[PDB]
Amino acid sequence: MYAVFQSGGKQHRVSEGQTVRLEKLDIATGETVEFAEVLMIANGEEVKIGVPFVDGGVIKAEVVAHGRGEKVKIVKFRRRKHYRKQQGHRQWFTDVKITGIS
Amino acid sequence: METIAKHRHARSSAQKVRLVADLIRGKKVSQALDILTYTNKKAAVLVKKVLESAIANAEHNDGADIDDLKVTKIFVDEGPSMKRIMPRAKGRADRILKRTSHITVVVSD
Amino acid sequence: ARVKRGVIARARHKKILKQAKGYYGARSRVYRVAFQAVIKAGQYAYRDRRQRKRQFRQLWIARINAAARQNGISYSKFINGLKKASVEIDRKILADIAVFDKVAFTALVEKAKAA
Amino acid sequence: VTGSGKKPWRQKGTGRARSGSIKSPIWRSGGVTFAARPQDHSQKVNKKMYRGALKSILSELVRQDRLIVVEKFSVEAPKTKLLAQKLKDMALEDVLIITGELDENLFLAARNLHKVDVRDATGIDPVSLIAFDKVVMTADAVKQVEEMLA
Amino acid sequence: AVQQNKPTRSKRGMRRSHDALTAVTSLSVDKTSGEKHLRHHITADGYYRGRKVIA
Amino acid sequence: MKTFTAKPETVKRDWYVVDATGKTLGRLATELARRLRGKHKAEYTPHVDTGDYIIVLNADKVAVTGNKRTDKVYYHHTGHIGGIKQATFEEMIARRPERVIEIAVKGMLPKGPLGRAMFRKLKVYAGNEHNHAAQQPQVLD
RNA sequence: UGUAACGGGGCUAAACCAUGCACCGAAGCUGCGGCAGCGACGCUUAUGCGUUGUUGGGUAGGGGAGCGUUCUGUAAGCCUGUGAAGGUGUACUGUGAGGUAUGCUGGAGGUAUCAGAAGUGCGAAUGCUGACAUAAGUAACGAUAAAGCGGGUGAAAAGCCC
RNA sequence: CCCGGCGAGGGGAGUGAAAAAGAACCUGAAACCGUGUACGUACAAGCAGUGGGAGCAUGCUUAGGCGUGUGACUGCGUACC
Ligand SMILES: [Mg+2]
Ligand SMILES: [Mg+2]
Ligand SMILES: [Mg+2]
Ligand SMILES: [Mg+2]
Ligand SMILES: [Mg+2]
Ligand SMILES: [Mg+2]
Ligand SMILES: [Mg+2]
Ligand SMILES: [Mg+2]
Ligand SMILES: [Mg+2]
Ligand SMILES: [Mg+2]
Ligand SMILES: [Mg+2]
Ligand SMILES: [Mg+2]
Ligand SMILES: [Mg+2]
Ligand SMILES: [Mg+2]
Ligand SMILES: [Mg+2]
Ligand SMILES: [Mg+2]
Ligand SMILES: [Mg+2]
Ligand SMILES: [Mg+2]
Ligand SMILES: [Mg+2]
Ligand SMILES: [Mg+2]
Ligand SMILES: [Mg+2]
Ligand SMILES: [Mg+2]
Ligand SMILES: [Mg+2]
Ligand SMILES: [Mg+2]
Ligand SMILES: [Mg+2]
Ligand SMILES: [Mg+2]
Ligand SMILES: [Mg+2]
Ligand SMILES: [Mg+2]
Ligand SMILES: [Mg+2]
Ligand SMILES: [Mg+2]
Ligand SMILES: [Mg+2]
Ligand SMILES: [Mg+2]
Ligand SMILES: [Mg+2]
Ligand SMILES: [Mg+2]
Ligand SMILES: [Mg+2]
Ligand SMILES: [Mg+2]
Ligand SMILES: [Mg+2]
Ligand SMILES: [Mg+2]
Ligand SMILES: [Mg+2]
Ligand SMILES: [Mg+2]
Ligand SMILES: [Mg+2]
Ligand SMILES: [Mg+2]
Ligand SMILES: [Mg+2]
Ligand SMILES: [Mg+2]
Ligand SMILES: [Mg+2]
Ligand SMILES: [Mg+2]
Ligand SMILES: [Mg+2]
Ligand SMILES: [Mg+2]
Ligand SMILES: [Mg+2]
Ligand SMILES: [Mg+2]
Ligand SMILES: [Mg+2]
Ligand SMILES: [Mg+2]
Ligand SMILES: [Mg+2]
Ligand SMILES: [Mg+2]
Ligand SMILES: [Mg+2]
Ligand SMILES: [Mg+2]
Ligand SMILES: [Mg+2]
Ligand SMILES: [Mg+2]
Ligand SMILES: [Mg+2]
Ligand SMILES: [Mg+2]
Ligand SMILES: [Mg+2]
Ligand SMILES: [Mg+2]
Ligand SMILES: [Mg+2]
Ligand SMILES: [Mg+2]
Ligand SMILES: [Mg+2]
Ligand SMILES: [Mg+2]
Ligand SMILES: [Mg+2]
Ligand SMILES: [Mg+2]
Ligand SMILES: [Mg+2]
Ligand SMILES: [Mg+2]
Ligand SMILES: [Mg+2]
Ligand SMILES: [Mg+2]
Ligand SMILES: [Mg+2]
Ligand SMILES: [Mg+2]
Ligand SMILES: [Mg+2]
Ligand SMILES: [Mg+2]
Ligand SMILES: [Mg+2]
Ligand SMILES: [Mg+2]
Ligand SMILES: [Mg+2]
Ligand SMILES: [Mg+2]
Ligand SMILES: [Mg+2]
Ligand SMILES: [Mg+2]
Ligand SMILES: [Mg+2]
Ligand SMILES: [Mg+2]
Ligand SMILES: [Mg+2]
Ligand SMILES: [Mg+2]
Ligand SMILES: [Mg+2]
Ligand SMILES: [Mg+2]
Ligand SMILES: [Mg+2]
Ligand SMILES: [Mg+2]
Ligand SMILES: [Mg+2]
Ligand SMILES: [Mg+2]
Ligand SMILES: [Mg+2]
Ligand SMILES: [Mg+2]
Ligand SMILES: [Mg+2]
Ligand SMILES: [Mg+2]
Ligand SMILES: [Mg+2]
Ligand SMILES: [Mg+2]
Ligand SMILES: [Mg+2]
Ligand SMILES: [Mg+2]
Ligand SMILES: [Mg+2]
Ligand SMILES: [Mg+2]
Ligand SMILES: [Mg+2]
Ligand SMILES: [Mg+2]
Ligand SMILES: [Mg+2]
Ligand SMILES: [Mg+2]
Ligand SMILES: [Mg+2]
Ligand SMILES: [Mg+2]
Ligand SMILES: [Mg+2]
Ligand SMILES: [Mg+2]
Ligand SMILES: [Mg+2]
Ligand SMILES: [Mg+2]
Ligand SMILES: [Mg+2]
Ligand SMILES: [Mg+2]
Ligand SMILES: [Mg+2]
Ligand SMILES: [Mg+2]
Ligand SMILES: [Mg+2]
Ligand SMILES: [Mg+2]
Ligand SMILES: [Mg+2]
């Protein structure tokens, strides 16, 4: 059932049905997306290869949320040299629910 | 019922009284009153009088029955310390601290 | 205008002492000691975001090298075999497939065998 | 600060931080490093700038319609009760009643009223014309202020 | 002489683990009167092994 | 996705036998230390003891190349005033043949609780007979 | 002081020399987001950007833009016993100084916005004052002239009385 | 009233809006010292954290997943001025 695909400059081993958090897409809050960058599909045997992507495989998904992650503090501190820095960060994500491993 | 009784500003440090107060903990009042009769310490007399009070405290006011009574919570807290000077050799002065304790006893069932 | 500063300082100490919550001894209880630990925790936190990426790559590569040698191929020839077959699948997944679906994994090594 | 200039303890020898006086600001109960002195905070303004500012603010009241210009404005007898009642017909509350001929009758009648203030056309201010919600100017007062500001 | 730097709550505790004193848990009973006392010691009233010792 | 990590409870540890007769010490010890750690297994995790139980029988008969049967010394301090005790590879096998494989493996494993934990699994033996017949320890090479 | 002159185990190849494709390997480069500084840009317009290339380690130091505090004006206004400030938790939120809301405690003050003025922010100065630790229940209890027993009073007596 | 030495100190009752407002008396922080609950902790080496991470203990709604506390084991890691 599971299939592999590239999204936010990185790949995801995903199954049909489950939710997946991935990097922000330029998409509305409840539209839909079609990943034609499918690298692999598994069931009985394996529809692998295709050079970068398979052939006629498309991973269809639905956009769940458009939130920001945990606050990651960044503390750069040079000991002894009268210097320190403070910087928060919240990475944007897009949660997507898979609805078709063709 | 819980029925608290406590010696506040008891002239003895926590450390010493807490040594006795570990003997009695989750023990039957009748058994606990005996121990402190034959515990050879000043703090035994100090803690006993609080418990022996706490039991009557409990029997008169609230709960009654001496048989079913256990010392549930007994604890000592460091009270105020009164400062005193003690002169040492070669002119220097040393601040002695006369320490006090807040002995609390809780006799529940 | 005299500015008494008992309110603002306590809040600043209290903020940091909350970040040091969990540490052993005075490092949790005592601002002057905690503030160092909270900074060093930040220095290590900044560092280990870089090391997380290194360690996991090693961790996957070990799993792939383990799973490949079961099938008879060493990691070096496997990845070259995949790169010569122009397979874009990363270590993260190869290691995940290697653990979970070995019946699947076998075919990737058999594909690497061809090249 | 009251005290002696004598060193509480000698420079060296004693295992303590070198001290010179009881009065030093790093100590308790004496010092305050940069102690304030009774100082004059009043600052210069150029005649043309003060006139220009009055001309600027007094012109803006014509836009906002806070400047209620009138003919003769004067209470009958020295009484607040009449002044409070007569402003209800005029539909006012918080005002600066500017007048050329300053009546004692009108003045005495507007001390106890908080939101009313009665100032002479000569003694107009920048802050007051801005502060109050309307400004009632007498035809004589306009003529005086016109000549004053120029 | 003199500590180089202060010990902890833990160490201070670790040292005191043995300071805890034990109870008696071994009270006798006088044959005649039925009074509690220490073993081989006389009673409060003045008895020892069911016989009157001191008035 | 958070990657899989082996769970100490779920790990299914296997038993093996390795006849060390006529084997090269280091190249044996290396392959032993590889398995003991749990490297060969595809579910390898560095913080869990995934490796297998190994029985190394005929340890006394282990072979070494060059002049190391005489030349190779095993130094150890006694934790004393000036007690540095040495022993050659002949003299080591002469007294304690189990120590040779033990020491050769121990160094190759990691150092720490898990490192000591994954050594426990190794079961060296001088004689051909082993009393671990109950586990059905299959043959390994 | 201890092997102690490969980092160790260990090796006749896991050494050396020569070639050959592999792979690992950094915050280096590429990938996908997000932020900011400049310079150009169609020339927009009074600046958002179809953009657009580009940077963006940093001590002394120089130049920008901010947070917060007590106080004065807006304020005899606004929020407050249907619970202020302060104390103490929790959950959101901003790139940071921080900010918002609320549980308990508290029992009466607080203060938007935009301005103004500062005793305006502390971890260090063998800093100054108070509080509390540590060593530690450790040393010591002040002449080595010496106590012993009985009775008395007392809640209790080695020390008080006889 | 009750315990105690016709004590110190407490516990009830009673006043009061309130007595953890009871005179050591508004508020009651921190250091520091405790009592009880959850986990860890007696073959294990070092600025005591940090990334990874099993188990165990607790909450929520669902018939599956999270948060919080803990942190076995493990890569890196020599405080601040
Ligand atoms: Mg884009
Ligand atoms: Mg206990
Ligand atoms: Mg003395
Ligand atoms: Mg003396
Ligand atoms: Mg003298
Ligand atoms: Mg003030
Ligand atoms: Mg924790
Ligand atoms: Mg945490
Ligand atoms: Mg400390
Ligand atoms: Mg704390
Ligand atoms: Mg570093
Ligand atoms: Mg990298
Ligand atoms: Mg002089
Ligand atoms: Mg000096
Ligand atoms: Mg000193
Ligand atoms: Mg001063
Ligand atoms: Mg004074
Ligand atoms: Mg003064
Ligand atoms: Mg000036
Ligand atoms: Mg007004
Ligand atoms: Mg008046
Ligand atoms: Mg003119
Ligand atoms: Mg003129
Ligand atoms: Mg030191
Ligand atoms: Mg001891
Ligand atoms: Mg010798
Ligand atoms: Mg290591
Ligand atoms: Mg074990
Ligand atoms: Mg030597
Ligand atoms: Mg050597
Ligand atoms: Mg080497
Ligand atoms: Mg080589
Ligand atoms: Mg070469
Ligand atoms: Mg770069
Ligand atoms: Mg980018
Ligand atoms: Mg150009
Ligand atoms: Mg661009
Ligand atoms: Mg810079
Ligand atoms: Mg501003
Ligand atoms: Mg503000
Ligand atoms: Mg303010
Ligand atoms: Mg104000
Ligand atoms: Mg006013
Ligand atoms: Mg008023
Ligand atoms: Mg009012
Ligand atoms: Mg009114
Ligand atoms: Mg006023
Ligand atoms: Mg507010
Ligand atoms: Mg409320
Ligand atoms: Mg409230
Ligand atoms: Mg508040
Ligand atoms: Mg804000
Ligand atoms: Mg604000
Ligand atoms: Mg509100
Ligand atoms: Mg409120
Ligand atoms: Mg008032
Ligand atoms: Mg105020
Ligand atoms: Mg305020
Ligand atoms: Mg204001
Ligand atoms: Mg408001
Ligand atoms: Mg506001
Ligand atoms: Mg506004
Ligand atoms: Mg200051
Ligand atoms: Mg301070
Ligand atoms: Mg400093
Ligand atoms: Mg004071
Ligand atoms: Mg003692
Ligand atoms: Mg000692
Ligand atoms: Mg001792
Ligand atoms: Mg001693
Ligand atoms: Mg002594
Ligand atoms: Mg004496
Ligand atoms: Mg002496
Ligand atoms: Mg003498
Ligand atoms: Mg003599
Ligand atoms: Mg008598
Ligand atoms: Mg008498
Ligand atoms: Mg009597
Ligand atoms: Mg009497
Ligand atoms: Mg009597
Ligand atoms: Mg009696
Ligand atoms: Mg006597
Ligand atoms: Mg005597
Ligand atoms: Mg009585
Ligand atoms: Mg009595
Ligand atoms: Mg008496
Ligand atoms: Mg009292
Ligand atoms: Mg009394
Ligand atoms: Mg009461
Ligand atoms: Mg009654
Ligand atoms: Mg009642
Ligand atoms: Mg009442
Ligand atoms: Mg009432
Ligand atoms: Mg209350
Ligand atoms: Mg209330
Ligand atoms: Mg009460
Ligand atoms: Mg009450
Ligand atoms: Mg209460
Ligand atoms: Mg109460
Ligand atoms: Mg009050
Ligand atoms: Mg109070
Ligand atoms: Mg408190
Ligand atoms: Mg407190
Ligand atoms: Mg417990
Ligand atoms: Mg337990
Ligand atoms: Mg346990
Ligand atoms: Mg051992
Ligand atoms: Mg253990
Ligand atoms: Mg140790
Ligand atoms: Mg270490
Ligand atoms: Mg640690
Ligand atoms: Mg941590
Ligand atoms: Mg972590
Ligand atoms: Mg985890
Ligand atoms: Mg974690
Ligand atoms: Mg559980
Ligand atoms: Mg549940
Ligand atoms: Mg480690
Ligand atoms: Mg290290």
Curated annotation (Swiss-Prot), chain A:
Q: Name one GO biological process term.
A: cytoplasmic translation
Q: Which PROSITE patterns match?
A: RIBOSOMAL_L21
Q: Where are the transmembrane segments?
A: none
A molecular function annotated in GO for this UniProt entry is:
rRNA binding
Q: Which UniProt keywords apply?
A: Ribonucleoprotein, Ribosomal protein, RNA-binding, rRNA-binding
Q: Which InterPro entries match?
A: bL21-like, bL21-like_sf, Ribosomal_bL21, Ribosomal_bL21_CS
**What Pfam families does UniProt report for this protein, alphabetically?**
Ribosomal_L21p
Gene Ontology CC annotation, any one: cytosol
Describe, as the record does, how this protein assembles with itself and its partners: Part of the 50S ribosomal subunit. Contacts protein L20.
Per the entry, what this protein does is: This protein binds to 23S rRNA in the presence of protein L20.
The family assignment reads: Belongs to the bacterial ribosomal protein bL21 family.
What name appears for this protein in its UniProt entry? Answer: Large ribosomal subunit protein bL21
- Gene for this chain: rplU
From Swiss-Prot, chain B:
Provide the effect of R8C. Answer: In strain: SK1048; decreases translational rate, tRNA binding and subunit association at 44 degrees Celsius; does not alter 23S rRNA or uL4 interactions; not erythromycin resistant
Carries keyword Ribonucleoprotein? yes
Q: Name one GO molecular function term.
A: structural constituent of ribosome
Question: Could you name the domain of life of the organism this protein comes from?
Answer: Bacteria
Alphabetically list the UniProt keywords: Antibiotic resistance, Ribonucleoprotein, Ribosomal protein, RNA-binding, rRNA-binding
Give me the residues that bind L-tryptophan, please.
K90
- One Pfam family, short name please? Ribosomal_L22
A GO term (biological process) for this protein? translation
**Stored CDD domains:** Ribosomal_L22 (cd00336)
Indicate yes or no for the key word 4Fe-4S: no
Q: What is the effect of changing A93 to S/T/V?
A: Abolishes translation elongation arrest of SecM
Q: Which residues form the signal peptide?
A: none
Any GO CC annotation of this UniProt entry: cytosolic large ribosomal subunit
User: Which family is annotated?
Assistant: Belongs to the universal ribosomal protein uL22 family.
Q: How does it assemble?
A: Part of the 50S ribosomal subunit. In TnaC-stalled ribosomes forms part of the binding pocket for L-Trp with the leader peptide and uL4.
Other notes: The wild-type allele (erythromycin sensitive) is dominant over the resistant allele, and is also dominant over the temperature-sensitive allele at both low and high temperatures.
Q: What is this protein called?
A: Large ribosomal subunit protein uL22
From which source organism is this entry? Answer: Escherichia coli (strain K12)
Swiss-Prot record, chain D:
Annotated GO biological processes are: cytoplasmic translation; DNA-templated transcription termination; negative regulation of cytoplasmic translation; negative regulation of DNA-templated transcription; negative regulation of translation; response to antibiotic; ribosome assembly; transcriptional attenuation
**What's the effect of swapping K12E?**
In strain: N282; confers erythromycin resistance. Ribosomes bind erythromycin poorly and have reduced peptidyltransferase activity
Q: Which UniProt keywords apply?
A: Antibiotic resistance, Repressor, Ribonucleoprotein, Ribosomal protein, RNA-binding, rRNA-binding, Transcription, Transcription regulation, Transcription termination, Translation regulation
Q: Where is this region: Disordered?
A: 1-20
Stated role: One of the primary rRNA binding proteins, this protein initially binds near the 5'-end of the 23S rRNA. It is important during the early stages of 50S assembly. It makes multiple contacts with different domains of the 23S rRNA in the assembled 50S subunit and ribosome.
The similarity annotation says:
Belongs to the universal ribosomal protein uL4 family.
Q: What else is known?
A: The erythromycin sensitive allele is dominant over the resistant allele.
Its name, as the record gives it, is Large ribosomal subunit protein uL4
- List the source organism: Escherichia coli (strain K12)
The UniProt gene name for this protein comes to: rplD
UniProtKB/Swiss-Prot annotation, chain F:
Q: Identify the Pfam families for this entry.
A: Ribosomal_L13 (PF00572)
GO CC terms of this entry: cytoplasm; cytosol; cytosolic large ribosomal subunit; ribosome
Output the superkingdom of the source species: Bacteria
InterPro entries the record matches? Ribosomal_uL13, Ribosomal_uL13_bac-type, Ribosomal_uL13_CS, Ribosomal_uL13_sf
Q: Which Gene3D superfamilies match?
A: Ribosomal protein L13 (3.90.1180.10)
Give UniProt keywords alphabetically: Ribonucleoprotein, Ribosomal protein
Q: Name one GO biological process term.
A: negative regulation of translation
Q: Which GO terms describe its molecular function?
A: large ribosomal subunit rRNA binding; mRNA 5'-UTR binding; mRNA binding; structural constituent of ribosome; zinc ion binding
Does the keyword Ribonucleoprotein belong to this entry? yes
Family per record: Belongs to the universal ribosomal protein uL13 family.
Q: State what this protein does.
A: This protein is one of the early assembly proteins of the 50S ribosomal subunit, although it is not seen to bind rRNA by itself. It is important during the early stages of 50S assembly.
Its subunit composition reads:
Part of the 50S ribosomal subunit.
Q: What is this protein called?
A: Large ribosomal subunit protein uL13
Q: Could you tell me which species this protein originates from?
A: Escherichia coli (strain K12)
